[PDB]
Amino acid sequence: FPELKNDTFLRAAWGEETDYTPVWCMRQAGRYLPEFRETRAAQDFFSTCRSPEACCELTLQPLRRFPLDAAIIFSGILVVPQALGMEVTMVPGKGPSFPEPLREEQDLERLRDPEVVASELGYVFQAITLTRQRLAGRVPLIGFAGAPWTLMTYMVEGGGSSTMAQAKRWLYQRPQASHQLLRILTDALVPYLVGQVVAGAQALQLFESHAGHLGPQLFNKFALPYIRDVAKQVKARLREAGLAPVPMIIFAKDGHFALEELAQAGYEVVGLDWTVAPKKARECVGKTVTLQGNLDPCALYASEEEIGQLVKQMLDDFGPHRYIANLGHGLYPDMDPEHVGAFVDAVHKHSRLLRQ
Amino acid sequence: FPELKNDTFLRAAWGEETDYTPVWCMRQAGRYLPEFRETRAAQDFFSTCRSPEACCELTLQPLRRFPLDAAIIFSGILVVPQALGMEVTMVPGKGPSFPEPLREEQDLERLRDPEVVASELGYVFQAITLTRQRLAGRVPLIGFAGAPWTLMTYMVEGGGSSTMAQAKRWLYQRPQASHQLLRILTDALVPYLVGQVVAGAQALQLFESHAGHLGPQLFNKFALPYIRDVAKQVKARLREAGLAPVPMIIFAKDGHFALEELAQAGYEVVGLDWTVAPKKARECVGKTVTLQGNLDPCALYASEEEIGQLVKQMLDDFGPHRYIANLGHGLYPDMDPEHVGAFVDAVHKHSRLLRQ
Ligand SMILES: Cc1c2[nH]c(c1CCC(=O)O)Cc1[nH]c(c(CCC(=O)O)c1C)Cc1[nH]c(c(CCC(=O)O)c1C)Cc1[nH]c(c(CCC(=O)O)c1C)C2
Numbered sequence A, B: 001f002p003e004l005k006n007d008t009f010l011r012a013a014w015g016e017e018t019d020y021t022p023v024w025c026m027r028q029a030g031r032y033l034p035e036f037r038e039t040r041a042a043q044d045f046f047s048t049c050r051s052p053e054a055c056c057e058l059t060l061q062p063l064r065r066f067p068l069d070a071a072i073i074f075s076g077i078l079v080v081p082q083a084l085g086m087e088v089t090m091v092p093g094k095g096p097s098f099p100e101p102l103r104e105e106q107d108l109e110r111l112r113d114p115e116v117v118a119s120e121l122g123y124v125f126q127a128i129t130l131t132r133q134r135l136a137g138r139v140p141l142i143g144f145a146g147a148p149w150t151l152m153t154y155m156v157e158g159g160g161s162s163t164m165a166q167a168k169r170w171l172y173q174r175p176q177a178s179h180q181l182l183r184i185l186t187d188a189l190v191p192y193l194v195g196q197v198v199a200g201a202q203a204l205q206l207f208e209s210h211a212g213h214l215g216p217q218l219f220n221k222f223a224l225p226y227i228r229d230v231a232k233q234v235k236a237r238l239r240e241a242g243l244a245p246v247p248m249i250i251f252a253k254d255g256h257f258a259l260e261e262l263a264q265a266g267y268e269v270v271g272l273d274w275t276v277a278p279k280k281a282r283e284c285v286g287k288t289v290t291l292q293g294n295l296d297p298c299a300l301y302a303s304e305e306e307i308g309q310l311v312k313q314m315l316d317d318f319g320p321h322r323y324i325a326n327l328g329h330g331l332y333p334d335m336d337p338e339h340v341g342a343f344v345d346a347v348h349k350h351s352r353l354l355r356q
């Protein structure tokens, strides 16, 4: 692959001092871009995911607009449940659905052996290799997957939920089957994530988007062990294959309660939602790990001037070291690309002022 | 197995009233789908048939496109002659061939004992069980086989024929050897069909695709007895194994002349080609059996609007009761998937209008 030119994001991830704070945005390839909608209009979502050229194009679009310090491959977290043998649809304005969710223990029998999942996800690897070549070293490319608990929620609920009542009913009433499912997911995720690195990914983010529905007791029992196992095993396999392990990011949305434990889970970077005050997060995680985040995505509805001031304040609270700027969650479809631009420029401008 | 969610097809097959008319299409897994061609490009046809995952994928593809009321397992009718010990090929754009057809009585000696055939077809059972699990109760799964006479034609002719002159020359010149062959086929088919149900099939269709080459006299002598024996024996074996018998469909293409006899042959459903007027078929078969069919497959070359009107007329002629919609024969490779979609949507739309 082409040599990396701007490695600021990786240096920050590993905890090195940098000349400025690197920034990227969750869902930077997203509907808020008119060009994203145009490219997507051609296929259904999961078909787009299976076209390496379409994924590469969608990955590159935000970088043509903004000097983001990382690209993230266009894909979905739900490709893993799909590769395990569940049927998923992207519903006309209602989002992802599994019309046949897992509801009893016997339903686990219809899943693939997790050791075959990576082969089913070759298309993601193809997209990654293509995008890495086309980026030509501009910035690092981030690969990603959903975390075991969050993937379980989709598989059991059959889509989004305000309570996760069915998935939590599994944890309390079916603890053994729940552990079985979470282990299947873990065993699928590890080879998938390794394959993403083999294909060219230079960092990995694990999205535990549904962390917040669990308290600490359930999180520690059912989410945390598998978060830890993913990191441990991915790093092991990469080292054994003669490759360099990449920085890994754990993002537990609404996971305020788990920050101390997440800081000791084998990830270089802990990503934060906007509800956690940066200084409190720093106290929780300590001084080695890098923090990522955490601007309220809705802050981008504010004026460009206001966005710059909110960014200044955020950067003051995080301080210059061990920090990668991002939003607290992904961009929303009605946001103005110029305000995303304002966010990026502000992190760059203020982080430099903050150093000298 | 997962509990069946949409059982409309089975209710219709047994002759129960339903809220709408269920529909499926012969060759719904077929070349008209670009994704079918892609999946097939990897192997030769009979090798694809021997991969449970490939068969499951091909079975599911049409359901991802259209709300069909049944799935049919991807396989071939020629797996039975192959399992009996004949060598078959799928010729580069010339279709199935047996380079060493049966031509004299002594040639029967090279066939397996029909009681071992089911064991040779384990791969079909594996595909069925996998597909049943993966479908997760969305719709019922149909298993199938060729009828004895039609299988004989392939075995003697060595492929397709416009006249079946060699196979008919067997019936007239070699009646005893012909009965011997038809009995071998019957004795192979029964355990195969039972095994398909044991593996998860929820209905069975027997394809007498080559019925039309026979008149009534030859059909009644050489085809009908074995059609009857298949149904009787399959139901007996299932009951004796403690399983529930499934609805069975007999489809005699070009079999206008045999409809009265087919209605008394022990099948819940008589399938019709497009040449038989629905009202005349209803008169022939009487009021218990369910009819299946019968739109000219070539009608799908017409505009989506025209397809809807032809469907409306067809449904008017059949009436709402004791009817499963399908084409009169399988989809052709040059047909437009959107027109197949139009067919499905039209049956659903008009059948509901026809009830209330
Ligand atoms: C990383 C990523 C994701 N989605 C997409 C990407 C592409 C990478 C690029 O982001 O910029 C494209 C991606 N994926 C999807 C879309 C929108 C569909 C469309 O384009 O019409 C896009 C752009 C579909 C999708 N897929 C998902 C949802 C949310 C459902 C819910 O609210 O519960 C949705 C809406 C599941 C999903 N997908 C993702 C998450 C994690 C979000 C986070 O925690 O920050 C989740 C939970 C992550």
Ligand SMILES: Cc1c2[nH]c(c1CCC(=O)O)Cc1[nH]c(c(CCC(=O)O)c1C)Cc1[nH]c(c(CCC(=O)O)c1C)Cc1[nH]c(c(CCC(=O)O)c1C)C2
Binding pocket: B026, B027, B028, B029, B030, B031, B040, B045, B072, B073, B074, B075, B076, B077, B078, B090, B095, B096, B144, B159, B160, B161, B207, B208, B209, B253, B329, B330
């Ligand atoms: C049920 C079924 C069949 N074929 C195939 C299936 C898979 C199930 C899914 O249909 O949708 C795949 C199936 N089987 C075959 C194909 C095409 C080969 C390819 O994919 O290149 C497919 C998709 C090969 C095949 N196999 C056969 C033919 C026809 C030969 C002739 O015209 O005499 C052909 C072309 C024999 C056959 N096969 C079948 C019949 C009955 C057709 C009917 O009466 O409606 C017959 C007569 C039935």
